[PDB]
Design a protein around this motif. Sequence first.
Motif, PDB file in Angstrom:
ATOM      1  N   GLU B 113       0.841  -1.181   0.000  1.00  0.00           N
ATOM      2  CA  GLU B 113       0.000   0.000   0.000  1.00  0.00           C
ATOM      3  C   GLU B 113       0.876   1.230   0.000  1.00  0.00           C
ATOM      4  OE1 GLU B 113      -2.764  -1.027  -0.647  1.00  0.00           O
ATOM      5  OE2 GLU B 113      -2.341  -3.088  -0.019  1.00  0.00           O
ATOM      6  N   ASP B 114       0.721   2.066  -1.012  1.00  0.00           N
ATOM      7  CA  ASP B 114       1.554   3.250  -1.115  1.00  0.00           C
ATOM      8  C   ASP B 114       1.407   4.061   0.147  1.00  0.00           C
ATOM      9  OD1 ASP B 114       1.707   2.114  -3.571  1.00  0.00           O
ATOM     10  OD2 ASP B 114       1.286   3.943  -4.712  1.00  0.00           O
ATOM     11  N   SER B 115       0.243   3.980   0.773  1.00  0.00           N
ATOM     12  CA  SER B 115       0.065   4.671   2.029  1.00  0.00           C
ATOM     13  C   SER B 115       1.145   4.172   2.948  1.00  0.00           C
ATOM     14  CB  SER B 115      -1.297   4.350   2.615  1.00  0.00           C
ATOM     15  OG  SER B 115      -1.438   2.955   2.821  1.00  0.00           O
ATOM     16  N   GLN B 116       1.243   2.857   3.060  1.00  0.00           N
ATOM     17  CA  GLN B 116       2.253   2.277   3.918  1.00  0.00           C
ATOM     18  C   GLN B 116       3.622   2.583   3.372  1.00  0.00           C
ATOM     19  OE1 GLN B 116       0.942   0.354   6.579  1.00  0.00           O
ATOM     20  NE2 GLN B 116       2.966   0.583   7.525  1.00  0.00           N
ATOM     21  N   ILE B 117       3.744   2.585   2.052  1.00  0.00           N
ATOM     22  CA  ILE B 117       5.038   2.819   1.445  1.00  0.00           C
ATOM     23  C   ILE B 117       5.619   4.089   2.012  1.00  0.00           C
ATOM     24  CG2 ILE B 117       6.204   3.521  -0.661  1.00  0.00           C
ATOM     25  CD1 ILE B 117       4.569   1.603  -2.209  1.00  0.00           C
ATOM     26  N   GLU B 118       4.836   5.151   1.975  1.00  0.00           N
ATOM     27  CA  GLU B 118       5.324   6.409   2.480  1.00  0.00           C
ATOM     28  C   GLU B 118       5.672   6.238   3.939  1.00  0.00           C
ATOM     29  OE1 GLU B 118       5.495   8.002  -0.281  1.00  0.00           O
ATOM     30  OE2 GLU B 118       4.267   6.332  -1.004  1.00  0.00           O
ATOM     31  N   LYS B 119       4.800   5.569   4.677  1.00  0.00           N
ATOM     32  CA  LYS B 119       5.027   5.414   6.104  1.00  0.00           C
ATOM     33  C   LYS B 119       6.356   4.736   6.379  1.00  0.00           C
ATOM     34  CE  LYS B 119       1.022   3.392   7.091  1.00  0.00           C
ATOM     35  NZ  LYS B 119       0.193   3.553   5.865  1.00  0.00           N
ATOM     36  N   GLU B 120       6.613   3.629   5.702  1.00  0.00           N
ATOM     37  CA  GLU B 120       7.841   2.887   5.949  1.00  0.00           C
ATOM     38  C   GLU B 120       9.050   3.708   5.562  1.00  0.00           C
ATOM     39  OE1 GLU B 120       7.825   0.338   7.723  1.00  0.00           O
ATOM     40  OE2 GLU B 120       5.631   0.341   7.721  1.00  0.00           O
ATOM     41  N   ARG B 121       8.931   4.453   4.474  1.00  0.00           N
ATOM     42  CA  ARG B 121      10.031   5.298   4.062  1.00  0.00           C
ATOM     43  C   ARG B 121      10.451   6.093   5.266  1.00  0.00           C
ATOM     44  NH1 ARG B 121       7.795   7.033   0.521  1.00  0.00           N
ATOM     45  NH2 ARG B 121       8.718   6.075  -1.344  1.00  0.00           N
ATOM     46  N   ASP B 122       9.478   6.666   5.947  1.00  0.00           N
ATOM     47  CA  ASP B 122       9.789   7.492   7.097  1.00  0.00           C
ATOM     48  C   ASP B 122      10.405   6.661   8.195  1.00  0.00           C
ATOM     49  OD1 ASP B 122       8.399   9.143   5.449  1.00  0.00           O
ATOM     50  OD2 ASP B 122       6.642   9.328   6.752  1.00  0.00           O
ATOM     51  N   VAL B 123       9.828   5.497   8.453  1.00  0.00           N
ATOM     52  CA  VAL B 123      10.363   4.628   9.476  1.00  0.00           C
ATOM     53  C   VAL B 123      11.811   4.315   9.192  1.00  0.00           C
ATOM     54  CG1 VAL B 123      10.311   2.309  10.438  1.00  0.00           C
ATOM     55  CG2 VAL B 123       8.166   3.521   9.957  1.00  0.00           C
ATOM     56  N   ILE B 124      12.087   3.818   7.997  1.00  0.00           N
ATOM     57  CA  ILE B 124      13.440   3.436   7.686  1.00  0.00           C
ATOM     58  C   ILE B 124      14.328   4.641   7.807  1.00  0.00           C
ATOM     59  CG2 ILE B 124      15.009   2.639   5.899  1.00  0.00           C
ATOM     60  CD1 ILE B 124      12.999   0.823   4.862  1.00  0.00           C
ATOM     61  N   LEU B 125      13.920   5.739   7.207  1.00  0.00           N
ATOM     62  CA  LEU B 125      14.779   6.897   7.222  1.00  0.00           C
ATOM     63  C   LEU B 125      15.092   7.312   8.642  1.00  0.00           C
ATOM     64  CD1 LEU B 125      13.354   9.142   4.366  1.00  0.00           C
ATOM     65  CD2 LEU B 125      15.663   8.195   4.535  1.00  0.00           C
ATOM     66  N   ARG B 126      14.065   7.474   9.467  1.00  0.00           N
ATOM     67  CA  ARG B 126      14.292   7.969  10.822  1.00  0.00           C
ATOM     68  C   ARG B 126      15.186   7.028  11.615  1.00  0.00           C
ATOM     69  NH1 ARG B 126      13.018   5.806  14.848  1.00  0.00           N
ATOM     70  NH2 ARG B 126      13.377   7.786  15.948  1.00  0.00           N
TER      71      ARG B 126
END
Lengths: 189, 395
Positions: B113-126
């Motif tokens: 889910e791109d919704s999640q995609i964005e979310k994980e991006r943030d998770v990984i990045l942070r």
Amino acid sequence: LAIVHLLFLHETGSNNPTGLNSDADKIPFHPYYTIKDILGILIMFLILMTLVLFFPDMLGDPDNYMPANPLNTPPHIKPEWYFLFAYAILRSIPNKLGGVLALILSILILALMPFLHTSKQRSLMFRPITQILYWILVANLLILTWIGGQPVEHPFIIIGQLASISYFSIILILMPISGIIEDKMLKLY
Amino acid sequence: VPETQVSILDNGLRVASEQSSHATCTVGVWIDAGSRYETEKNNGAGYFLEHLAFKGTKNRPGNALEKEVESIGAHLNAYSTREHTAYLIKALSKDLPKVVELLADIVQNSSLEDSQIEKERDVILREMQENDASMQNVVFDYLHATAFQGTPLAQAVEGPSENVRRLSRTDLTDYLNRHYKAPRMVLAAAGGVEHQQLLDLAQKHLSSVSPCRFTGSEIRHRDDALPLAHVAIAVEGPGWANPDNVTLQVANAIIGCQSFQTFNISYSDTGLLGAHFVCDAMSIDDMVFFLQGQWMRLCTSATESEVTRGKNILRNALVSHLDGTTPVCEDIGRSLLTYGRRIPLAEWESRIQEVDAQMLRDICSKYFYDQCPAVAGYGPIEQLPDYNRIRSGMF
Ligand code: HEM
């Protein structure tokens, strides 16, 4: 005395050509400045053995091979090259005593050198006017070395007199004034 | 010890299992896909897909996946290395029918889910912004890097923040559709499982699945505000398949300042063999010396007693049903991915007992002596000696 030298230096460490604090970039000496000293030793040995084995008398004076004539003297007498200028200085001052003193000062002026440093930068890597004055100092040191060789007659004498005046004026007067001017150019003074 | 039985399906997916009397089971999927297969434009695709793989598939939209695998009472885990990816579950054996199905969707028709995609991006990045706290991982990710230069192996599993931000469903889809092939997949099961039932479940579900050179080098990340320094020194490991790996493990068992661990990381015909130690700055030099001495010591002090010692510690490291299902599964998945077969513990014992002191110092001399090392330092590492010095043990 040299041993004393090495101790009084390790307390402070060696300087670098930029004149800055090199504490951020220091390396060991064994593998970096040892092989460099070995290479310099090899080059110095090359120059020494080509001085010995090929031109063994280009720096000496043939007079050496003459058993001293307690009675007679060499028409042309000259101190060896390394000191040639030293005596050049003497020849310049008319007064005997003056000559001796100036001669001594010639060497001693160096000791006096750490009290003449008026710049906020240690090295001359970023100081072009004092670089020019330094190379003029090396130039008239070579001139004084040549004059010593020349005999007593015009115009060798005048050059000697000027060259000595210029030598003492560059070391004593011109370099601290130039360092003040260089500090003024960088908006430091 | 019961033998590990391996079958092969249409897709090419292998179904390996090692039945044991323990009650629960660890069923996992391994995949021969890591950061080594990424081409610097998708350097974090495996990691970010590993984040997205539990956030719902068509069949399990939203929290369904986690919920069911939670309800069943199973623990869902996944990890990614530079060469392998694993999605494993530990559950009640009676849950096998449930388990296989869930895992199937994880590795196939996973719906990012791109919704999640964005979310994980943030998770990984942070997290990455803080992943810097794991000094040891840092030291070990430059060691890989400094040595494996200009080679896929260098790129970390995580990938450069840059890529993390710049990643899209289609890219992921590619990595998913490219590196998730059925012949590069092992379905491994350990514990209370029957091999025929697991083979039937793999036929029912999951039947749809469609250079490296060592470079001597050194990277000294100097930051003097850190209290402790971490230094890793490695040479080129033989590989995964190389037989001498075992004589090298015994050598590590001989070695065993501070936190002076030893590692033999193996990848496909390459690896890093060495030591990582953390010490106060003032002692770094000394420690380095010690380590070097020990290695040459192996080259010169393989007292038979110590030889045996090392063999014994290695003997008590071999993984087995006692260690439990997961440990075993994990070994089944890595063995089918790397060796192509599960090496039994009797063969490991034979390869251990054939090791003596003479072949240990022969294999050590080949790899430690006269081998430019890869050095990675982080912390107050000014007294850490430079390369010429390090490579030059001179003793
Ligand atoms: C007996 C003759 C001399 C010997 C054998 C000698 C030897 C040395 C040695 C071995 C060093 C350390 C290496 C180096 O710094 O490059 C050194 C440093 C030094 N010497 Fe001398 N020296 C002598 C005369 C002099 C004289 C007459 C001066 C002053 C004009 C001098 C000024 C220095 C300075 C300033 C350094 C430190 C330079 C630096 O490292 O940045 N030395 N000397």
